[PDB]
Amino acid sequence: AHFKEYQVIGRRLPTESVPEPKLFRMRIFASNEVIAKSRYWYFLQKLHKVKKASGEIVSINQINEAHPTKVKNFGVWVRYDSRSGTHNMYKEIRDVSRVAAVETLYQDMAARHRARFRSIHILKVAEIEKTADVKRQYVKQFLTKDLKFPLPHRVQKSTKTFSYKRPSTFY
């Protein structure tokens, strides 16, 4: 999914008594500006007394990456509703941007725990700054010093349906 990390500002409507309600900020992950606002008004509605017709979406802004050519050790916190009892989880992604880490968060979350996008709240996406605090083994086996590995069995892509010679798979 081509996600786009959005930044939304929302406020209650100005009352004649107090014409300055506080601007609340969210930085969410959504596919476009419509479900951006509709996931904003579902998160803020769990926290403060405001519906969609009682407040105005002040500002939409895309958040492009601070460095989109750098491998980052993301530690994402998440909660998700299972088929019985909701749970807190903390995964580990090693992709290049916050936009492209949450996709493969959702993919393997729907793969290993069968939770769809309507059951998942992304809590906090933090780039871990060093190698000490990260404790997931599927990243501590990737960050190793001067890592080499081969791809042992490279199958061939095909274009025709009659190869005149026996295939070689050696790489």
């Binding site: 491998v71 992709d95 990737f142 001067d146 890592l147 080499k148 081969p150």
Partner: protein, 135 residues
């Protein structure tokens, strides 16, 4: 003890600075260098001279060439363009017959009709001058 004959395979290992080749996509067929790995399936490539930008691509699109050149981990485009020209990769690549065959295969579909007919004339002379000499 006498010497042991142990051999399995000589892989072309995906390592730092492995000169890899994009086989699918918009910028396919131009060289690139694996800067640093990301996961099992996607690496970070950066090839300055050939025209590709600095991307993070699957290993499905790429093809590992046997020739490797050195660089430190996480290298930027400037440092890899320095190491690229100082290691002379674009000249060392064309010496392989794989690049020779890929240029010949590029040329054959670039031939026009009269360049095909002159091939049809010239292919009536090589065997005509050779196949009488084997007796």
């Amino acid at each position: 003890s006498t010497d042991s004959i142990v051999k399995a395979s000589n892989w072309r290992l995906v390592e730092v600075g492995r000169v890899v080749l994009i086989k699918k996509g918009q910028s396919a067929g131009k060289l690139a260098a694996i800067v640093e790995i990301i996961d099992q399936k996607k690496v970070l490539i950066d090839g300055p001279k050939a025209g590709v930008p600095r991307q993070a691509i699957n290993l499905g699109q790429v093809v590992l060439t046997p020739l490797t050149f050195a660089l430190p981990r996480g290298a930027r485009t400037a440092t890899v363009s320095k190491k690229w020209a100082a290691a002379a990769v674009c000249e060392k690549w064309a010496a392989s017959s794989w690049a020779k065959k890929i240029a010949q295969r590029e040329r054959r579909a670039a031939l026009t009709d009269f360049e095909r007919f002159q091939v049809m004339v010239l292919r009536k002379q090589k065997r005509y001058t050779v196949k009488k000499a084997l007796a």
